[model samples]
Target: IVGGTASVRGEWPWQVTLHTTSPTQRHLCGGSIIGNQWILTAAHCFYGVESPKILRVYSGILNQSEIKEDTSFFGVQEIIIHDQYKMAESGYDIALLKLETTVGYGDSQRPICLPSKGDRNVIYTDCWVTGWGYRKLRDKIQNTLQKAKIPLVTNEECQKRYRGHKITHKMICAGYREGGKDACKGDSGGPLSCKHNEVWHLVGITSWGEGCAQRERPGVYTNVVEYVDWILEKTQAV
Candidate 1:
């Protein structure tokens, strides 16, 4: 979350950290709690990763050093990556992780609401993104989560800016035309949350960008609205 403000507790409760369980373990991506046992993330987060057991979900913690027992780590029971996710740029970058244990929801840990039928195709405001990603293009990931408000651009305008690239209906673009605030490399799989009816709804899944907050290169996301049905089907069948 480069060029954003430090996010505190009581906000973005659904945002979580994804850490590799290797010897050189560290947070490599972000995720969202969509259910007591389900986590939503990006498929590329598993790129070259062999086992779901190698990933640990760090939830309900604001600082990286605070990995306590009560509301902290969880093991991934299963990973469900979208079938169409051949590549991040090709647009089906979303994935879901089933936890080994069903977590209890509270102020510090809770599930984000998925968009309902009425919320379908709705262009939203009050949108924000949070992660423990980089604070700058060359910096390391932060200890505390950073959050930034980003405005979504019309598909036509986004297509104009991304002239030679693809802007599928499954992708959403949000950022500043002049650049400054956006999701970064380590923020992949985090939620782009927006308010609707006084509750936050998952809107986008952090996917990619040319660089961290680059001019004319807004952050690209997977449009959650397009996959609501798919999410329900998968989660239900699990």
Candidate 2:
């Protein structure tokens, strides 16, 4: 993430990397482990990245240097994109990936919490986003994870900022009105987590933005709260 601080190991246990099936796996995007074998991320992240057959996920690690085939790498057994997520511009950008094997929650790995289905009134605070995104447009994706604290932008206020586009309830916006820190390129599908009673909940999935930390154009995210039922239905059946 641009203009963010380096994250300590295991600081965000839910943070994981989506990658190509290379010996030196190419980081495709970021994701969250929300269940035994389920990963939550953006559907748009699969664009031109080939199928999930070539998609591998890595967890329980921090730096890219810690990557090794047998350590934490696991193959994707299934990919489930929301039926309505046809276009990146339109909404419904969420997707799920089931791992070949279930991962264990530990000191360096753990699933993030999902807000209760009854969570209608949102008072998001202590929110943060972490990723191996580029520090700038000209820079390469980082090896170490970066994190930043961002404030939630109200849907009405978010709509006013982007007059050209519609700010639907399906998406959440977070950042400052003045240009500064944000989820940069390759941070796609990463978790936008918020603390609820000292435990982190998967509040949003990093989706899009006008630019890296652009003025008035806060980062747009897939509102995970709106899809709790969908998530439960799909995962419960599996």
Candidate 3:
């Protein structure tokens, strides 16, 4: 989410909650449904984590605390982290989760479309980010999903601000140069969607940033277009 505001139910149908069970069940990260049984997320979210057996995927709900009949839950059957994903610099910070059961499609649950072949990367486009992430730095995680609008930032401008950091071509930046509008903790692995020609496309996946909504520190995302081929290849295989 960009800032603090509740998102309407079904507003972002592709959003998914990834939970882990260490001692008990809890939300760990956010994700997007790109396939009937596949979820896209950040590779770092599962880095150093062994065993997909403890992970669960939750979808079709606005409030994480509420139990709805339409909501779906599935055990993670497998996690496919990108071959070149690294924890230190946030490049190739993408991963896909195969659900044990195929999720039913409805208003509350649906897959966000990946960019079409030959589609150029969108720049300075108005887009929105949604998730059940933290409201602020060190703040409590919100139960209801939140959303905020952020314009895409050119890689050149982002790179200038994020000096000493690797702002790579495989990534995209979104948010304000002045900050206060960005994805925060718990929002990682969620979708950064942009509309083109009246259809929405998943442009990026929430990755890392210097801090939560800090000045000159726009949130970094895994450019979905950069890995569209990989996503298609993997989805078709299983």
Candidate 4:
């Protein structure tokens, strides 16, 4: 519902989940409708995780109940895991799920714009990230999507801040210095959109994090700028 502002609204294709008969009790990660037939999400979300068919994408919706009435649940036709992904080191964690048909975009539907690749070097500026994550305590997750404002941390600062993990330029970090507002488990693969020239561009994709919303340990995301070449190359392969 964070639309019509300077921020860009993202269209979520499906809610992220794990294997559970009770569909309601699942971690619904965020996804974006890109291209005519592709839904981009974190590779780790689907690589060895859950049943793809059970995953439902709801566009033009804010509440879970409104999904059937206000959105489209396009069944995944194919899963494309980037060949460069490394399980040991966790590089190239991008994944693309091809939809049976293209989800239309105007007011009800639209795709997040990808970075220009040339703008890869731009960082440290503030960017906005929106998702339907948490609105209350850490343990609780929400069916309604929410938006949060965050800054794009410097690659050096991120590398130093997260010393334990191998923070590469391939990834980006966002959250308060004290780590108050951040994307949670359900916000995975959602767009970390940046505004440039009045056009909102997807600079990063929600990838991983430790807890729901921890201080200092904000959330980790895949830097789309670093993987634009890979995304185009792999998409052409399929």
Candidate 5:
């Protein structure tokens, strides 16, 4: 969320902060609440992680250091990375986390709506990305959640800029053509929400990018609609 401003408390009810605490309590990545007990995030975030038990999820909080009254910590029950996903590739970059206990809904805690298969026409629309990521390259991560409005970049134009990066069908690209705004380190696995028909739809999951905000190098994301069936199958199985 570099180049963004502090988000209003409870504005992004679906936002979640993924953390680790063996060495010290620190934020690893960002995630979105997709169900009562399910969270959506990036597969690469836990690529080398051995145990999911060490990971923790925090919801309904804008500041990490000062946990809010509505903040709830949920233990991980299961971590499901996409079957076809690999550390060597960027196509299948999504993952789901099941909580040991279901979360209660409120103004500050709620699940985001996933885009339906019929909602594919919402591409190229303006969207917002939110997280507590660093404000600049190699900078300290923010304690307060931040948000920035970024437009969706078409895959065709996105691929033209990152040919070596290999943007795929399962991936979506978003940012400005002139660059300057993007999700930096610690923002990975966050939501890219776009409003369609007057409702916000979870369109992408922050995945990767060249740098924080390099020119013509828009941030790439996991196309949520492309894997809606897979998400439903996994979440329902639990």
Candidate 6:
């Protein structure tokens, strides 16, 4: 874990909240603002059928509940899941949401630059996470955004930690001996960013975790670099 560094979590560029059915029901997932009309999140977050009114991408704002503050509610216009996605094995667990409109940079909610393709080593090897997930243990997913920096471990290390499921090259890992500093439940679909040219680039998409911030059971993310081509194809077609 990158200790002592102040949190870089919260804010618009790197936050995505998935709202399921029901007015008060919602799940917090991380999302990278890829473009004015595009937001990327994990497919698992939308496994069940959802509604545009329920599934919202509130970007360009900090407080998700304050719909007035967000630049775009971007009612989920379309969902594009990876063709190879397998729910049982969690293979290709990724998806993209087409927003109803574009978001501006100065609007407080903005898009983050995607790292160049082939940057797999950046995740779980030497990386960090920023989010509004739970702070200390026993706490709930914070309404306010927060940032936590953790080391990006390799698939080999994650395999040792999470058994039964194989760690595909399409996935990357990170966490600690006690899994204290990693992203918790409400942090899915968030960015696993790495430094490049002095800027943090989104490299991974938060997919799953053994448990919300459990020790030695850190979170696992889908390697974005591995799906760059596929993502672009899907986005361009839309």
Best by lDDT: 1
Give one digit per residue, the lDDT tens place, for model 4 in 16-115: 2222123453545666666767777777766444555666555666655454423446666677778877642365778887777677656656776788
Model 6 is weakest, by summed lDDT over 10 consecutive residues, at 1-10
Q: List where candidate 1 sits over 4 angstroms from the true fold.
A: 68-72
How many residue pairs collide in each prediction?
0, 0, 0, 7, 0, 12
Give the best candidate by TM-score. 1
Assess every candidate by TM-score: 0.96, 0.95, 0.94, 0.81, 0.95, 0.83
Model 6, span 1-238: residue lDDT tens: 1121234334335556655545565554667888777888888766565555567666544554455433446677888778888672466988888876776665466667776755544332346676656664466656555566677777788888888888887887777777567776667777877777667677778777766667777678887778888878988875
Q: Per-residue lDDT of 1-238 in model 3, one digit per residue for the tens?
A: 5465899989989998888877677789999999889999999899656999988788887888873435457889999998987672659999999999989999989998888757764453658888888877887668999988888888899999888887888988997878988998889999898888788899989988887888888889998888988998888976
Candidate 4 wrong stretches, greater than 4 Å: 1-27, 47-51, 68-71, 86-89, 124-126, 136-138
- Cα lDDT of model 5 by residue, 1-238, tens digit: 7679899998899999999765776789999999999999999998667887888899988898865434458999889999899852467889999999999999989998999988787454669999899889989889899999998888899999887777787888888888888999999999998887787789999988888988898989999999999998998776
Task: Report residue 119 deviation for candidate 1 (angstroms).
Answer: 2.2
lDDT of each: 0.88, 0.88, 0.85, 0.64, 0.87, 0.68
Evaluate residue 146 in candidate 2 and report its C-alpha lDDT on the 0 to 100 scale.
92
Candidate 1 local lDDT, 31-88, one digit each (tens): 9999989999999999988898888898887888785444458999999999888988
TM-score of 4: 0.81
For candidate 1, what is the TM-score? 0.96
The segments of candidate 6 whose C-alpha lies over 4 angstroms from its true place after superposition are: 1-12, 21-28, 68-72, 118-126, 136-139
Report clash pairs, candidate 4: 13-57, 13-58, 14-56, 14-57, 16-29, 105-109, 132-145
On the 0 to 100 scale, the lDDT of residue 103 in model 4 is: 71
